[PDB]
Amino acid sequence: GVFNYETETTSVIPAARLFKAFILDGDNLFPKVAPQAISSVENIEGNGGPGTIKKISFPEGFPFKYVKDRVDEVDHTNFKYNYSVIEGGPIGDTLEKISNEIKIVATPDGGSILKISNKYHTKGDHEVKAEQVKASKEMGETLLRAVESYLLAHSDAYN
Numbered sequence: 725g726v727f728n729y730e731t732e733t734t735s736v737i738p739a740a741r742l743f744k745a746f747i748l749d750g751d752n753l754f755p756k757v758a759p760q761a762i763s764s765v766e767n768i769e770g771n772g773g774p775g776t777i778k779k780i781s782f783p784e785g786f787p788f789k790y791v792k793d794r795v796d797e798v799d800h801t802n803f804k805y806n807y808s809v810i811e812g813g814p815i816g817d818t819l820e821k822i823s824n825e826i827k828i829v830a831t832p833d834g835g836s837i838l839k840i841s842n843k844y845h846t847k848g849d850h851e852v853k854a855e856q857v858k859a860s861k862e863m864g865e866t867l868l869r870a871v872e873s874y875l876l877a878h879s880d881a882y883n
């Protein structure tokens with residue numbers, strides 16, 4: 725079945741720039757700005773649109789070795805990005821996939837709000853518990869803050 729978790733968070737970076745950097749160039753940026761959270765990002769198949777598979781490797785000592793993420797949809801107009809965790813880490817005989825949706829909305833103060841949905845699809849009925857969702861939110865927030873700091877310090881990046 726499906727467990728749905730939603731959260732919101734804010735950024736001081738304008739939506740279109742954040743989307744370009746944080747969403748569209750995560751493969752380059754994440755290992756660069758947050759090597760302590762993501763060791764590498766490998767493009768396995770696809771040119772960036774629906775169906776593109778990436779392998780995200782975590783550094784030694786992390787709970788999981790890697791996940792493979794599949795790009796589901798990329799909306800350049802409305803700053804929406806949907807992707808699914810389809811292999812590795814928590815995926816296996818109890819969890820089929822985690823389907824994620826991210827939308828970035830402009831705010832009049834020149835920042836943005838990120839609205840995030842994560843839907844865990846389980847095999848049989850055993851539950852997703854707070855600890856796995858908490859860890860996921862922590863990682864996402866660490867990645868956001870690292871990218872934000874980089875975009876603040878490198879004004880010519882992603883204009």
Ligand SMILES: O=S(=O)(O)c1cccc2cccc(Nc3ccccc3)c12
Nearest residue numbers: 729730731824840842857860861864865
């Ligand atoms: O979805 S993620 O792709 O990890 C993600 C991507 C980008 C930014 C995120 C910010 C906060 C939490 C996330 N994950 C999250 C995890 C559990 C519950 C709610 C949000 C973020």
